[PDB]
Design an enzyme around this catalytic site. Structure first.
Site, PDB file in Angstrom:
ATOM      1  N   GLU A 282       9.197 -15.263 -11.717  1.00  0.00           N
ATOM      2  CA  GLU A 282       9.748 -13.784 -10.898  1.00  0.00           C
ATOM      3  C   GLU A 282      10.878 -14.550  -9.911  1.00  0.00           C
ATOM      4  OE1 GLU A 282       5.565 -12.889  -9.216  1.00  0.00           O
ATOM      5  OE2 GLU A 282       6.379 -11.124  -9.238  1.00  0.00           O
TER       6      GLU A 282
ATOM      7  N   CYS B 285       0.098  -5.845 -14.526  1.00  0.00           N
ATOM      8  CA  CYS B 285      -0.209  -7.117 -13.763  1.00  0.00           C
ATOM      9  C   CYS B 285      -0.826  -8.190 -14.446  1.00  0.00           C
ATOM     10  CB  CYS B 285      -1.036  -6.675 -12.406  1.00  0.00           C
ATOM     11  SG  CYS B 285      -1.352  -8.114 -11.510  1.00  0.00           S
TER      12      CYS B 285
ATOM     13  N   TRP C 268       0.092 -14.120  -4.761  1.00  0.00           N
ATOM     14  CA  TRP C 268       1.213 -15.258  -4.745  1.00  0.00           C
ATOM     15  C   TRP C 268       2.139 -15.098  -6.020  1.00  0.00           C
ATOM     16  CZ3 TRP C 268      -4.483 -16.493  -5.007  1.00  0.00           C
ATOM     17  CH2 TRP C 268      -4.779 -16.642  -6.394  1.00  0.00           C
TER      18      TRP C 268
ATOM     19  N   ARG D 122      -4.583  -9.956 -12.738  1.00  0.00           N
ATOM     20  CA  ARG D 122      -5.711  -9.279 -12.595  1.00  0.00           C
ATOM     21  C   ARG D 122      -7.000 -10.156 -12.540  1.00  0.00           C
ATOM     22  NH1 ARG D 122      -5.234  -4.214 -16.159  1.00  0.00           N
ATOM     23  NH2 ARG D 122      -3.647  -5.331 -17.379  1.00  0.00           N
TER      24      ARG D 122
HETATM   25  C1  HEM Z   1      -2.801 -12.897  -6.926  1.00  0.00           C
HETATM   26  C2  HEM Z   1      -1.734 -13.169  -7.782  1.00  0.00           C
HETATM   27  C3  HEM Z   1      -0.953 -12.105  -8.444  1.00  0.00           C
HETATM   28  C4  HEM Z   1       0.027 -12.516  -9.376  1.00  0.00           C
HETATM   29  C5  HEM Z   1       0.237 -13.879  -9.866  1.00  0.00           C
HETATM   30  C6  HEM Z   1       0.495 -11.405  -9.763  1.00  0.00           C
HETATM   31  C7  HEM Z   1       1.732 -11.200 -10.852  1.00  0.00           C
HETATM   32  C8  HEM Z   1       2.252 -10.124 -11.101  1.00  0.00           C
HETATM   33  C9  HEM Z   1       3.678 -10.181 -11.759  1.00  0.00           C
HETATM   34  C10 HEM Z   1       4.182 -11.123 -12.394  1.00  0.00           C
HETATM   35  C11 HEM Z   1       3.981  -8.711 -11.772  1.00  0.00           C
HETATM   36  C12 HEM Z   1       5.319  -8.244 -12.569  1.00  0.00           C
HETATM   37  C13 HEM Z   1       6.397  -8.288 -11.659  1.00  0.00           C
HETATM   38  C14 HEM Z   1       7.593  -8.402 -12.356  1.00  0.00           C
HETATM   39  O1  HEM Z   1       7.891  -8.137 -13.586  1.00  0.00           O
HETATM   40  O2  HEM Z   1       8.619  -9.084 -11.327  1.00  0.00           O
HETATM   41  C15 HEM Z   1       2.919  -7.897 -11.301  1.00  0.00           C
HETATM   42  C16 HEM Z   1       2.817  -6.547 -11.167  1.00  0.00           C
HETATM   43  C17 HEM Z   1       1.969  -5.902 -10.366  1.00  0.00           C
HETATM   44  N1  HEM Z   1       1.155  -6.470  -9.738  1.00  0.00           N
HETATM   45 FE1  HEM Z   1       0.379  -8.167  -9.793  1.00  0.00          FE
HETATM   46  N2  HEM Z   1       0.053 -10.297  -9.237  1.00  0.00           N
HETATM   47  C18 HEM Z   1      -1.106 -10.635  -8.187  1.00  0.00           C
HETATM   48  C19 HEM Z   1      -1.625  -9.697  -7.386  1.00  0.00           C
HETATM   49  C20 HEM Z   1      -1.347  -8.393  -7.355  1.00  0.00           C
HETATM   50  C21 HEM Z   1      -2.189  -7.819  -6.097  1.00  0.00           C
HETATM   51  C22 HEM Z   1      -3.282  -8.475  -5.354  1.00  0.00           C
HETATM   52  C23 HEM Z   1      -2.118  -6.315  -6.651  1.00  0.00           C
HETATM   53  C24 HEM Z   1      -2.727  -5.348  -5.680  1.00  0.00           C
HETATM   54  C25 HEM Z   1      -3.813  -5.358  -5.253  1.00  0.00           C
HETATM   55  C26 HEM Z   1      -1.058  -6.374  -7.593  1.00  0.00           C
HETATM   56  C27 HEM Z   1      -0.787  -5.309  -8.225  1.00  0.00           C
HETATM   57  C28 HEM Z   1       0.248  -5.093  -9.273  1.00  0.00           C
HETATM   58  C29 HEM Z   1       1.148  -4.111  -9.475  1.00  0.00           C
HETATM   59  C30 HEM Z   1       0.747  -2.710  -9.194  1.00  0.00           C
HETATM   60  C31 HEM Z   1       2.117  -4.429 -10.273  1.00  0.00           C
HETATM   61  C32 HEM Z   1       3.142  -3.195 -11.027  1.00  0.00           C
HETATM   62  C33 HEM Z   1       4.206  -3.029  -9.943  1.00  0.00           C
HETATM   63  C34 HEM Z   1       5.062  -2.168 -10.596  1.00  0.00           C
HETATM   64  O3  HEM Z   1       4.996  -1.161 -11.550  1.00  0.00           O
HETATM   65  O4  HEM Z   1       6.441  -2.268 -10.246  1.00  0.00           O
HETATM   66  N3  HEM Z   1      -0.869  -7.696  -8.062  1.00  0.00           N
HETATM   67  N4  HEM Z   1       2.111  -8.876 -10.822  1.00  0.00           N
HETATM   68  N1  LIG Z   2       3.349 -11.942  -8.020  1.00  0.00           N
HETATM   69  C1  LIG Z   2       3.322 -10.662  -7.692  1.00  0.00           C
HETATM   70  C2  LIG Z   2       2.224 -10.168  -7.138  1.00  0.00           C
HETATM   71  C3  LIG Z   2       2.286  -8.693  -7.145  1.00  0.00           C
HETATM   72  C4  LIG Z   2       3.176  -7.787  -7.427  1.00  0.00           C
HETATM   73  C5  LIG Z   2       3.264  -6.420  -7.339  1.00  0.00           C
HETATM   74  C6  LIG Z   2       4.485  -5.709  -7.779  1.00  0.00           C
HETATM   75  C7  LIG Z   2       5.595  -6.388  -8.292  1.00  0.00           C
HETATM   76  C8  LIG Z   2       6.754  -5.434  -8.632  1.00  0.00           C
HETATM   77  O1  LIG Z   2       7.488  -6.368  -9.414  1.00  0.00           O
HETATM   78  C9  LIG Z   2       8.941  -5.535  -9.834  1.00  0.00           C
HETATM   79  C10 LIG Z   2       9.541  -4.337  -9.526  1.00  0.00           C
HETATM   80  C11 LIG Z   2      10.756  -3.900  -9.956  1.00  0.00           C
HETATM   81  C12 LIG Z   2      11.326  -4.668 -11.198  1.00  0.00           C
HETATM   82  C13 LIG Z   2      10.700  -5.803 -11.343  1.00  0.00           C
HETATM   83  C14 LIG Z   2      11.565  -6.817 -12.552  1.00  0.00           C
HETATM   84  N2  LIG Z   2      11.644  -6.070 -13.770  1.00  0.00           N
HETATM   85  C15 LIG Z   2      10.474  -6.165 -14.518  1.00  0.00           C
HETATM   86  C16 LIG Z   2      10.620  -5.637 -16.179  1.00  0.00           C
HETATM   87  C17 LIG Z   2      11.752  -5.098 -16.378  1.00  0.00           C
HETATM   88  C18 LIG Z   2      12.160  -4.600 -17.698  1.00  0.00           C
HETATM   89  C19 LIG Z   2      11.176  -4.872 -18.539  1.00  0.00           C
HETATM   90  C20 LIG Z   2      10.023  -5.339 -18.312  1.00  0.00           C
HETATM   91  N3  LIG Z   2       9.889  -5.849 -17.065  1.00  0.00           N
HETATM   92  C21 LIG Z   2       9.672  -6.188 -10.771  1.00  0.00           C
HETATM   93  C22 LIG Z   2       5.667  -7.841  -8.262  1.00  0.00           C
HETATM   94  C23 LIG Z   2       4.553  -8.748  -8.020  1.00  0.00           C
HETATM   95  N4  LIG Z   2       4.409  -9.746  -7.927  1.00  0.00           N
END
Ligand code: HEM
Ligand SMILES: Nc1ccc2ccc(COc3cccc(CNCc4ccccn4)c3)cc2n1
Ligand SMILES: [Cl-]
Length: 362
Positions: free
Chosen positions: A242, A65, A237, A68
């Site tokens: 994304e 993330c 948000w 954070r």
């Molecule tokens: C406040 C604005 C936030 C932004 C802009 C943000 C941004 C992101 C982005 C861009 C990803 C990558 C997902 C992808 O590659 O599609 C991500 C992953 C993640 N975010 Fe954040 N995030 C935010 C808030 C949060 C919150 C509130 C939590 C939990 C309380 C959280 C937990 C995570 C987790 C667990 C992942 C990994 C998901 C996975 O392994 O599939 N995020 N975040």
């Molecule tokens: N704004 C936000 C805020 C919180 C979010 C929490 C979780 C996620 C999950 O997100 C993904 C889940 C599955 C797949 C993908 C896209 N594949 C990422 C990737 C692929 C290959 C190599 C590296 N990275 C995202 C999004 C949140 N977004």
């Protein structure tokens, strides 16, 4: 049988949590009370303060993330009191409304009752609370391919989509003691959506693109001090890439880059023209412009990485180790223009944290 795993997780968590809340004196008595409770009952119950700070710790420890920096302002809603389908449904409705906040999005988590002794009290089937349906029939593709398997499960249960490219899936969840989930249509009044326009290219609206305002991830497990909250949807948000570089651009999602190239007036014939790169930039510009013009919170990947640099600096200033997943922190657009690309990160798993779990449909 397995109670000591719970007891040790509980010691590490309570120690660390109280430490940070400036309450280390209360630790010894709180661990006593917990030890009692585990023996008599087999589990323990978090205080409101422990649960709120645990869910914040879990966000701070989420290696993948970039967002954070704001971990400490997470809004934590304690719904461990729910017992009925109607209460679950209404707590999910309330989460949408309070997280949306008329476009000024509030990062929020709603925490449902935890797994008791392996047994789920509530099982959410949605990947996000707001998401579009996908269909594949007669080699004819409609909507979001990533939603095809959940959309087919929903239609075995009597839901039917209108087969637009942007049908809202219903909320779908199962209660302990029912064989089947229930589903509820989302009231449209609760769902903000953004039409995609471009700041300069009037014809961009001919694509008729839109996306929803708030990503509310609803299928991950929150683990805090040995307690397993398998149902705990949360939202931030969006970061604009994304939507613009993945949801609307990937070939296995909406796959819009050729149509983008045509409306911005460039040829899509030669790799050396970098037409996919140019289309990506214009689509991503359009997405940020559109959210901002409607008053819906969004962040661009440069500002997001600037925020993450400050998170890294706070971690050091507080004496906490930083962990991170380089392959997910870099953005999919111009990654080497961010500081992230130019350093490395320790990918160790620290708890509390959010985790994947098996989906109940296939
Ligand atoms: C406040 C604005 C936030 C932004 C802009 C943000 C941004 C992101 C982005 C861009 C990803 C990558 C997902 C992808 O590659 O599609 C991500 C992953 C993640 N975010 Fe954040 N995030 C935010 C808030 C949060 C919150 C509130 C939590 C939990 C309380 C959280 C937990 C995570 C987790 C667990 C992942 C990994 C998901 C996975 O392994 O599939 N995020 N975040
Ligand atoms: N704004 C936000 C805020 C919180 C979010 C929490 C979780 C996620 C999950 O997100 C993904 C889940 C599955 C797949 C993908 C896209 N594949 C990422 C990737 C692929 C290959 C190599 C590296 N990275 C995202 C999004 C949140 N977004
Ligand atoms: Cl998404």
């Amino acid at each position: 049988e397995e109670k000591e795993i719970l007891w040790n997780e509980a010691k590490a968590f309570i120690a660390a949590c109280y430490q940070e809340l400036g309450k280390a004196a209360e630790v010894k008595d709180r661990l006593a009370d917990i030890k009692s409770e585990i023996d008599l009952t087999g589990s323990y119950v978090h205080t409101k303060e422990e649960l709120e700070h645990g869910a914040k710790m879990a966000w701070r420890n989420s290696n993948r993330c970039i967002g954070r920096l704001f971990w400490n302002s997470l809004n934590v809603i304690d719904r461990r009191d729910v017992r009925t389908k109607e209460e679950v449904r209404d707590a999910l409705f309330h989460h949408i409304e309070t997280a949306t906040n008329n476009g000024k999005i509030r990062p929020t988590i709603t925490i449902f009752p935890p797994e008791e002794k392996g047994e789920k009290q509530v099982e959410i089937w949605n990947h996000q609370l707001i998401r579009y349906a996908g269909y594949e029939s007669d080699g004819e593709r409609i909507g979001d391919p990533a939603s095809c398997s959940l959309t087919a499960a929903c239609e075995e249960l009597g839901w039917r989509g209108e087969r637009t490219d942007f049908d809202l899936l219903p909320l779908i969840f199962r209660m302990k003691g029912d064989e089947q989930p229930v589903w509820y249509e989302l009231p449209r009044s609760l769902v903000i959506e953004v039409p995609i326009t471009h700041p300069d290219i009037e014809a961009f609206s001919d694509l008729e693109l839109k996306w929803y305002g708030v990503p509310i991830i609803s299928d991950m497990k929150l683990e805090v001090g040995g307690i397993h909250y398998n149902a705990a949807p949360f939202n931030g948000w969006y970061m604009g890439t994304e939507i613009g570089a993945r949801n609307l651009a990937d070939e296995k999602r909406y796959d819009k880059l050729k149509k983008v190239a045509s409306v911005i007036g460039i040829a899509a014939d030669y790799n050396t023209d970098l037409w996919k790169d140019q289309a990506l930039v214009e689509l991503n510009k359009a997405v940020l412009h559109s959210y901002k013009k409607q008053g819906v919170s969004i962040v661009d990947h440069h500002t997001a990485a600037s925020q993450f640099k400050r998170f890294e600096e706070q971690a050091e200033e507080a004496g906490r180790k930083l962990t991170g997943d380089w392959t997910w922190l870099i953005p999919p657009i111009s990654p080497a223009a961010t500081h992230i690309f130019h350093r490395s990160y320790d990918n160790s798993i620290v708890k509390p944290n959010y985790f994947y779990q098996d989906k109940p449909y296939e």
